[PDB]
Amino acid sequence: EQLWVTVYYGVPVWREANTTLFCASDAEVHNVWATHACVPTDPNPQEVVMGNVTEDFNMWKNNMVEQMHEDIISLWCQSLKPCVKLTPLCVTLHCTNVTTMREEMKNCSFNTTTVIRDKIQKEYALFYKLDIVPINTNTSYRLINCNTSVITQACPKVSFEPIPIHYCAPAGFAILKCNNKTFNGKGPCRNVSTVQCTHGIKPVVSTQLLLNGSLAEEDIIIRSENFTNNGKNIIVQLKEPVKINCTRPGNNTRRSINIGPGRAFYATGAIIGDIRKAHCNISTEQWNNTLTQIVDKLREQFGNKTIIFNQSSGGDPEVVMHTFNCGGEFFYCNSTQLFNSTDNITLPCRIKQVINMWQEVGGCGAMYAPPIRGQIDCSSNITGLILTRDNETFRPGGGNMKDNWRSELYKYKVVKIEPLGIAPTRAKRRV
Amino acid sequence: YKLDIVPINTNTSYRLINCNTSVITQACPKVSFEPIPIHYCAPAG
Amino acid sequence: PNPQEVVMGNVTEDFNMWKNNMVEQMHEDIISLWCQSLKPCVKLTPLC
Amino acid sequence: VTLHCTNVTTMREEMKNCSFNTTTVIRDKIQKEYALF
Amino acid sequence: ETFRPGGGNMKDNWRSELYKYKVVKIEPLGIAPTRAKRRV
Amino acid sequence: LGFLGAAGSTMGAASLTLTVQARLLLSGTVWGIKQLQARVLAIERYLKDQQLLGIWGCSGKLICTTTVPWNTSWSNKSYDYIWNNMTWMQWEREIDNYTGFIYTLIEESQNQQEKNELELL
Amino acid sequence: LGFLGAAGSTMGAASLTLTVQARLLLSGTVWGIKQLQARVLAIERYLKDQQLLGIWGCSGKLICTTTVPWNTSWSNKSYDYIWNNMTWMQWEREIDNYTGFIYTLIEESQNQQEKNELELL
Amino acid sequence: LGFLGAAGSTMGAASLTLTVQARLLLSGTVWGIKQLQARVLAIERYLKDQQLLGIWGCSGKLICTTTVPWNTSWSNKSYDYIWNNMTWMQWEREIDNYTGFIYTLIEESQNQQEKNELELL
Numbered sequence: 014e015q016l017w018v019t020v021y022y023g024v025p026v027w028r029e030a031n032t033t034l035f036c037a038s039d040a041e042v043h044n045v046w047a048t049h050a051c052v053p054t055d056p057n058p059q060e061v062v063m064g065n066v067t068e069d070f071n072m073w074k075n076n077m078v079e080q081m082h083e084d085i086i087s088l089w090c091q092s093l094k095p096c097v098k099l100t101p102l103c104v105t106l107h108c109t110n111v112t113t114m115r116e117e118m119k120n121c122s123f124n125t126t127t128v129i130r131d132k133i134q135k136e137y138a139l140f141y142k143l144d145i146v147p148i149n150t151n152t153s154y155r156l157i158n159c160n161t162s163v164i165t166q167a168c169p170k171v172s173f174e175p176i177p178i179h180y181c182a183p184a185g186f187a188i189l190k191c192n193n194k195t196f197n198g199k200g201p202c203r204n205v206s207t208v209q210c211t212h213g214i215k216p217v218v219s220t221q222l223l224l225n226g227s228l229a230e231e232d233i234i235i236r237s238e239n240f241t242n243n244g245k246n247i248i249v250q251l252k253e254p255v256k257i258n259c260t261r262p263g264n265n266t267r268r269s270i271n272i273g274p275g276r277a278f279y280a281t282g283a284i285i286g287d288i289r290k291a292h293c294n295i296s297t298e299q300w301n302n303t304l305t306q307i308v309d310k311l312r313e314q315f316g317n318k319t320i321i322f323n324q325s326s327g328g329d330p331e332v333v334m335h336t337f338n339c340g341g342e343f344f345y346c347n348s349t350q351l352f353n354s355t356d357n358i359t360l361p362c363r364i365k366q367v368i369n370m371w372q373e374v375g376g377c378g379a380m381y382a383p384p385i386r387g388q389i390d391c392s393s394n395i396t397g398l399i400l401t402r403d404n405e406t407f408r409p410g411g412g413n414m415k416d417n418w419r420s421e422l423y424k425y426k427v428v429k430i431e432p433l434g435i436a437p438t439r440a441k442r443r444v
Numbered sequence: 445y446k447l448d449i450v451p452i453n454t455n456t457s458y459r460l461i462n463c464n465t466s467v468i469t470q471a472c473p474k475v476s477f478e479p480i481p482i483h484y485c486a487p488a489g
Numbered sequence: 490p491n492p493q494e495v496v497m498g499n500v501t502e503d504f505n506m507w508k509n510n511m512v513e514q515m516h517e518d519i520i521s522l523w524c525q526s527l528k529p530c531v532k533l534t535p536l537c
Numbered sequence: 538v539t540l541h542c543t544n545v546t547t548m549r550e551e552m553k554n555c556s557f558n559t560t561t562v563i564r565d566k567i568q569k570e571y572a573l574f
Numbered sequence: 575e576t577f578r579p580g581g582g583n584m585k586d587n588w589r590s591e592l593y594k595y596k597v598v599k600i601e602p603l604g605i606a607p608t609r610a611k612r613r614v
Numbered sequence: 615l616g617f618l619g620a621a622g623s624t625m626g627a628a629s630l631t632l633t634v635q636a637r638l639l640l641s642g643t644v645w646g647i648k649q650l651q652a653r654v655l656a657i658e659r660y661l662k663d664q665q666l667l668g669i670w671g672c673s674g675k676l677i678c679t680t681t682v683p684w685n686t687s688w689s690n691k692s693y694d695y696i697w698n699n700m701t702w703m704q705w706e707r708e709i710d711n712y713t714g715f716i717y718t719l720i721e722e723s724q725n726q727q728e729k730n731e732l733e734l735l
Numbered sequence: 736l737g738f739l740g741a742a743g744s745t746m747g748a749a750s751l752t753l754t755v756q757a758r759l760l761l762s763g764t765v766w767g768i769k770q771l772q773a774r775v776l777a778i779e780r781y782l783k784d785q786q787l788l789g790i791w792g793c794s795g796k797l798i799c800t801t802t803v804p805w806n807t808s809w810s811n812k813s814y815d816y817i818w819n820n821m822t823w824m825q826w827e828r829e830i831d832n833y834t835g836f837i838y839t840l841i842e843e844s845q846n847q848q849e850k851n852e853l854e855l856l
Numbered sequence: 857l858g859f860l861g862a863a864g865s866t867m868g869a870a871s872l873t874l875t876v877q878a879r880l881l882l883s884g885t886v887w888g889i890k891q892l893q894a895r896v897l898a899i900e901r902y903l904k905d906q907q908l909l910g911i912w913g914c915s916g917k918l919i920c921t922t923t924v925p926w927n928t929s930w931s932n933k934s935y936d937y938i939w940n941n942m943t944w945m946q947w948e949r950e951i952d953n954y955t956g957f958i959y960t961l962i963e964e965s966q967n968q969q970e971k972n973e974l975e976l977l
């Protein structure tokens with residue numbers, strides 16, 4: 014026929030396009046995660062229900078995580094520069110036994126800067142054995158990271174609690190979320206939906222244990238492209254969250270040193286409570302409850318008590334011991350009992366002030382939190398779990414940063430609109 | 445000047461009035477200080 | 490270039506002096522100029 | 538800093554093997570390193 | 575006439591490559607007489 | 615219904631979602647720099663799409679009447695049968711590798727009756 | 736006369752200042768960052784107001800002919816009597832708490848005759 | 857042919873390069889800041905030119921039919937003789953020192969029939 018053409022604008026057509034994401038506070042003086050420059054308004058998102066869409070999601074290839082991975086490093090590293098720095102403090106410390114507070118505490122002397130530039134007074138402050146490293150016989154003791162990179166002090170007013178945030182692309186972009194908990198997303202989602210912006214996601218940092226995560230619908234999901242992959246390994250979503258509690262009831266005082274002009278370096282004062290190391294409290298039957306679930310499902314993907322949980326060989330402290338973050342502290346819990354294939358069991362935990370977690374990932378000064386004057390008594394949930402494949406034996410692992418955030422962005426993808434389209438109709442109304 | 449300097453030995457222990465509180469910076473000599481008039485007005489719309 | 494200063498008429502408009510934020514907007518502006526004009530300059534320390 | 542800086546003990550011409558009295562990495566205990574210039 | 579090496583000014587080492595280039599601005603607006611008054 | 619509402623709905627009778635797609639296309643520290651490279655992108659995205667509509671003599675109508683007829687090289691698709699059961703996703707994929715030629719052709723034709731308007735009076 | 740000229744002038748016969756309001760709407764270190772968050776804001780301010788006009792089928796006309804009639808819930812105002820002595824400031828305040836419905840309703844009608852245009856031929 | 861193609865071609869019959877000029881007008885660290893004050897300038901350059909066309913009632917047509925006639929103060933140029941041999945760049949130079957009056961005068965006439973449209977019905 015004498016078929017003409019016409020163009021329809023505003024029609025739904027898609028395309029995958031890497032781009033940037035916004036931040037939404039959804040909510041208080043400062044915070045390491047900004048949450049103040051983020052747009053707070055989320056006026057009743059539509060969460061429009063799409064249907065009959067055979068859309069494919071790729072979870073390894075998705076770059077929302079990679080875009081977010083660089084964002085987090087930027088926030089931490091950029092939130093440290095506009096405040097004091099430890100140096101000059103990593104001079105050799107005339108440092109001896111403790112005169113009684115004990116164990117890691119190694120009451121220690123400085124012999125460093127006065128405040129009036131020149132005089133140099135011999136002040137002192139406590140330190141932990143993990144923080145301090147040997148280079149005299151047993152007095153040559155300095156900081157563990159002064160040999161490698163400059164050290165910066167956490168800025169006291171800056172908080173650390175993981176205030177939830179939301180990510181979403183600007184206008185002209187859409188977010189695809191398929192609402193059905195049976196997807197190890199590498200193929201088609203059917204019940205897809207659009208949301209104006211992402212729901213609550215809490216940027217928490219840990220290793221081998223994901224805390225304060227999504228609420229499971231009484232289902233256990235394991236997502237990995239190749240169950241026999243030689244690289245990255247199993248990622249687990251757990252049962253209804255289990256109440257895990259950790260605390261260090263070691264009430265401390267706060268000491269001011271005035272390391273330099275308008276600097277006011279801080280360090281642990283003393284102990285006036287009871288010598289009780291940090292510990293974590295998990296229920297005794299919960300770990301068996303989740304055990305039987307993953308075990309029964311593991312019999313399908315893997316050959317069917319032949320299941321053995323063994324500790325990692327070692328090589329990196331950031332991986333061997335479980336990493337915690339509550340109340341501004343940074344615990345290091347010996348995870349022997351968690352993965353031994355096993356009242357209120359007690360899990361030992363140590364504390365080290367200086368952490369270089371953000372020095373080996375993007376590169377800048379190592380961080381160390383100042384002591385907190387009050388109690389912690391921090392309680393938290395647990396919804397994720399990480400294991401590695403070597404009868405089949407599972408061991409703790411991870412290491413790579415891009416693991417702790419894959420458990421919450423599996424059901425999200427950035428998509429580009431293509432409103433242009435051509436259709437044939439009748440035409441030639443014009444000249 | 446006496447106002448700038450503050451006492452901390454007997455009468456020579458005299459430092460600056462603000463070294464013990466905050467860092468001190470010097471204005472560059474080229475930077476002027478006269479209050480040149482300015483105008484404030486919003487963008488289009 | 491030669492502002493118009495157009496004159497409105499018969500307008501009953503209320504102006505709030507305490508509540509206006511032009512001053513508050515400009516108050517932070519002045520601090521920014523002063524504080525940001527000193528960083529690219531020599532620092533007295535070490536001299537105290 | 539002023540370099541306790543002498544002739545060359547052979548390297549020659551513009552090479553003037555030289556000492557520093559540096560500041561060391563432990564922020565104290567200056568060590569007397571050397572290098573060429 | 576004797577020639578000697580010189581220069582000194584930094585705006586010499588790059589003049590030899592941008593002699594045949596020029597930034598220009600477009601002026602898409604124009605007025606043309608025609609027949610009109612098709613509207614009201 | 616709403617932002618990209620009725621995406622899986624009918625092929626041709628789903629025009630009710632045209633207006634809701636158009637309205638939400640533009641109106642809707644570390645983050646601040648990111649916001650600058652998040653809002654300018656949204657602006658030119660709307661203008662780039664509006665650029666094609668404006669030059670073709672079909673600005674702000676949601677229907678773009680033209681004079682260039684169909685060509686055998688695109689595809690053979692019947693009327694009223696392909697227009698009730700077909701995924702609009704796949705339809706664009708069929709023409710994407712050959713979509714770009716139409717934009718130049720329409721403007722070449724759009725300039726024809728543009729000149730004849732003065733001549734025809 | 737000029738920028739917002741004749742603001743206090745008549746209600747209906749003060750249309751002469753429509754064009755001057757439109758031209759000035761967009762054409763017109765510490766401050767550099769401020770200017771960046773001062774010029775983009777001006778751009779979207781023009782586009783956001785232009786977005787509503789474009790979708791309603793009255794782009795670039797200064798008059799928006801429509802099909803949706805009045806509703807009793809807005810107000811009872813006579814013709815040629817309310818239109819010669821009333822503060823336009825107060826006029827907007829009356830409906831501002833219910834003006835949001837018009838934008839969606841007009842679009843729901845603007846798309847109707849868009850479809851009928853092809854059908855009516 | 858292309859970006860500013862056929863610039864030296866005929867005076868009036870070179871309309872074929874009108875559309876190619878319009879499409880390329882917008883679509884197309886140390887330098888990151890430079891890029892920010894390089895694309896916003898590109899955007900407003902398109903809008904500023906588009907502002908004049910939008911208010912004159914000739915948006916997206918490539919012609920602007922008006923009612924204001926010629927004036928003796930511009931120049932005396934014949935038809936079909938000046939329109940086949942003359943540099944367009946030189947043509948603009950003659951009126952550039954008096955071009956500004958046209959923009960205001962046209963809209964004073966554009967707003968006229970805008971009112972009469974409702975009156976004439």
Ligand SMILES: *[C@@H]1O[C@H](CO)[C@@H](O[C@@H]2O[C@H](CO)[C@@H](O[C@@H]3O[C@H](CO[C@H]4O[C@H](CO)[C@@H](O)[C@H](O)[C@@H]4O)[C@@H](O)[C@H](O[C@H]4O[C@H](CO)[C@@H](O)[C@H](O)[C@@H]4O[C@H]4O[C@H](CO)[C@@H](O)[C@H](O)[C@@H]4O)[C@@H]3O)[C@H](O)[C@H]2NC(C)=O)[C@H](O)[C@H]1NC(C)=O
Nearest residue numbers: 041172174175217224225338339340386387391392393394
């Ligand atoms: C998974 O999610 C859970 C739930 O959020 C989370 O547990 C929560 O941890 C946070 C810390 O990370 C806890 O919040 C802190 O709690 C204590 C005590 O506050 C409680 O008790 C007082 C008693 O009066 C109540 O008023 C109060 O509402 C709480 O119930 C405090 O140490 C903390 O307050 C300080 O931090 C705030 C945020 O930065 C500041 O706004 C506030 O001013 C306090 O700091 C100031 O005062 C201190 C006083 O000593 C001083 O030392 C500081 O220098 C500063 O001046 C804070 O409220 C929260 O209670 C936990 N929630 C529960 C239910 O236990 C898990 O941590 C999380 N998991 C992971 C891994 O992150």
Ligand SMILES: *[C@@H]1O[C@H](CO)[C@@H](O[C@@H]2O[C@H](CO)[C@@H](O[C@@H]3O[C@H](CO)[C@@H](O)[C@H](O[C@H]4O[C@H](CO)[C@@H](O)[C@H](O)[C@@H]4O)[C@@H]3O)[C@H](O)[C@H]2NC(C)=O)[C@H](O)[C@H]1NC(C)=O
Nearest residue numbers: 111112113114119120121122135136137138139282283284
């Ligand atoms: C870490 O080690 C350092 C170095 O040893 C240590 O610092 C010491 O603290 C004690 C705290 O008592 C200081 O001793 C005080 O010094 C003067 C002496 O004139 C007085 O203020 C005090 O005397 C009163 O208190 C005594 C009890 O403490 C009474 O016996 C006495 O009668 C007075 O009432 C007291 O002697 C001492 O000077 C410092 N030393 C240095 C070198 O700074 C610190 O306590 C250790 N920290 C921990 C946590 O163990």
Ligand SMILES: *[C@@H]1O[C@H](CO)[C@@H](O[C@@H]2O[C@H](CO)[C@@H](O[C@@H]3O[C@H](CO)[C@@H](O)[C@H](O)[C@@H]3O)[C@H](O)[C@H]2NC(C)=O)[C@H](O)[C@H]1NC(C)=O
Nearest residue numbers: 028029030031032073074075076077079080426427428429
């Ligand atoms: C958005 O852009 C990013 C890059 O800016 C895209 O991710 C990257 O995609 C490229 C291919 O386009 C990948 O390159 C290939 O990677 C490996 C390197 O060993 C190898 O296969 C090839 O030699 C090649 O270099 C790259 O790996 C990949 N990832 C990264 C981190 O760069 C991404 O696809 C884009 N996103 C979209 C279109 O949604």
Ligand SMILES: *[C@@H]1O[C@H](CO)[C@@H](O[C@@H]2O[C@H](CO)[C@@H](O[C@@H]3O[C@H](CO)[C@@H](O)[C@H](O)[C@@H]3O)[C@H](O)[C@H]2NC(C)=O)[C@H](O)[C@H]1NC(C)=O
Nearest residue numbers: 105106107108109121122123124125133134135136137152
């Ligand atoms: C901080 O560093 C200074 C560096 O001068 C230390 O000064 C040293 O103090 C010790 C005693 O604490 C002195 O030792 C004694 O000195 C004399 C002989 O010089 C004599 O009394 C004894 O035989 C003994 O050696 C030492 O001389 C003195 N100087 C040096 C260079 O070491 C100071 O002790 C340090 N303070 C802290 C808290 O570490």
Ligand SMILES: *[C@@H]1O[C@H](CO)[C@@H](O[C@@H]2O[C@H](CO)[C@@H](O[C@@H]3O[C@H](CO)[C@@H](O)[C@H](O)[C@@H]3O)[C@H](O)[C@H]2NC(C)=O)[C@H](O)[C@H]1NC(C)=O
Nearest residue numbers: 145146147148153155156157158159160161162328562563
């Ligand atoms: C800064 O200082 C630290 C602490 O001294 C340096 O650590 C060094 O680490 C290596 C590798 O582990 C040690 O070498 C050998 O390691 C094992 C475990 O002890 C064993 O084979 C030997 O006993 C030996 O220690 C080394 O001793 C250790 N210290 C030094 C002074 O080399 C770190 O490498 C230093 N960083 C930089 C950038 O210089």
Ligand SMILES: *[C@@H]1O[C@H](CO)[C@@H](O[C@@H]2O[C@H](CO)[C@@H](O[C@@H]3O[C@H](CO)[C@@H](O)[C@H](O)[C@@H]3O)[C@H](O)[C@H]2NC(C)=O)[C@H](O)[C@H]1NC(C)=O
Nearest residue numbers: 059060061062063064190191192193194203204205206207
């Ligand atoms: C495909 O995904 C959509 C969007 O999530 C699903 O619609 C959702 O269906 C559930 C179950 O009926 C609705 O939950 C109900 O909501 C209210 C309380 O909010 C109340 O009726 C019930 O107590 C229940 O919680 C949910 O509202 C609804 N979501 C939306 C946005 O309408 C749909 O079921 C999914 N389809 C399939 C086949 O899985």
Ligand SMILES: *[C@@H]1O[C@H](CO)[C@@H](O[C@@H]2O[C@H](CO)[C@@H](O[C@@H]3O[C@H](CO)[C@@H](O)[C@H](O)[C@@H]3O)[C@H](O)[C@H]2NC(C)=O)[C@H](O)[C@H]1NC(C)=O
Nearest residue numbers: 538539540541542543555556557558559567568569570571
């Ligand atoms: C780095 O600077 C130090 C500053 O103390 C230099 O130490 C100086 O070393 C020289 C020998 O190289 C010493 O000279 C000898 O000292 C004593 C008398 O004090 C005696 O043995 C001799 O009569 C001779 O004078 C000197 O005393 C010592 N101190 C000073 C203040 O000069 C060091 O040499 C410098 N290192 C380098 C590599 O330049």
Ligand SMILES: *[C@@H]1O[C@H](CO)[C@@H](O)[C@H](O)[C@H]1NC(C)=O
Nearest residue numbers: 062063064065066621622623
């Ligand atoms: C496709 O799904 C829609 C809802 O999104 C439903 O109305 C329609 O009947 C489905 N079509 C088929 C062929 O299953």
Ligand SMILES: *[C@@H]1O[C@H](CO)[C@@H](O)[C@H](O)[C@H]1NC(C)=O
Nearest residue numbers: 109110111112115116119151
């Ligand atoms: C003293 O320090 C040494 C060396 O670190 C340690 O082995 C010992 O246990 C400490 N003794 C006491 C009584 O604290």
Ligand SMILES: *[C@@H]1O[C@H](CO)[C@@H](O)[C@H](O)[C@H]1NC(C)=O
Nearest residue numbers: 192193194195201202203204
């Ligand atoms: C949703 O998940 C259920 C439970 O596994 C499954 O039976 C159903 O087919 C899924 N529906 C989809 C993807 O539309």
Ligand SMILES: *[C@@H]1O[C@H](CO)[C@@H](O)[C@H](O)[C@H]1NC(C)=O
Nearest residue numbers: 237238239240241242243244
């Ligand atoms: C998984 O990895 C193993 C080991 O490399 C390989 O033999 C196998 O083919 C992979 N599976 C798939 C589905 O590609």
Ligand SMILES: *[C@@H]1O[C@H](CO)[C@@H](O)[C@H](O)[C@H]1NC(C)=O
Nearest residue numbers: 225228253254255392393394
């Ligand atoms: C832990 O999960 C439970 C599930 O019911 C929820 O009610 C609770 O708020 C969660 N706790 C936190 C701190 O998110």
Ligand SMILES: *[C@@H]1O[C@H](CO)[C@@H](O)[C@H](O)[C@H]1NC(C)=O
Nearest residue numbers: 263264265266285386387388
């Ligand atoms: C810790 O000790 C300090 C000593 O001043 C006291 O003020 C504070 O209340 C104590 N914290 C407790 C009991 O949690």
Ligand SMILES: *[C@@H]1O[C@H](CO)[C@@H](O)[C@H](O)[C@H]1NC(C)=O
Nearest residue numbers: 256257258294295296357392
């Ligand atoms: C952990 O603390 C929570 C909150 O107080 C409590 O409900 C729970 O019983 C505790 N866990 C155990 C194992 O007692």
Ligand SMILES: *[C@@H]1O[C@H](CO)[C@@H](O)[C@H](O)[C@H]1NC(C)=O
Nearest residue numbers: 321322323324326353354406
């Ligand atoms: C863990 O592996 C080690 C060797 O790496 C072995 O000696 C040990 O018995 C294993 N433990 C368990 C509980 O399987």
Ligand SMILES: *[C@@H]1O[C@H](CO)[C@@H](O)[C@H](O)[C@H]1NC(C)=O
Nearest residue numbers: 333334346347348349350361
């Ligand atoms: C954890 O404790 C076990 C004994 O319960 C011990 O063998 C192991 O070395 C400890 N691990 C660490 C990292 O301290």
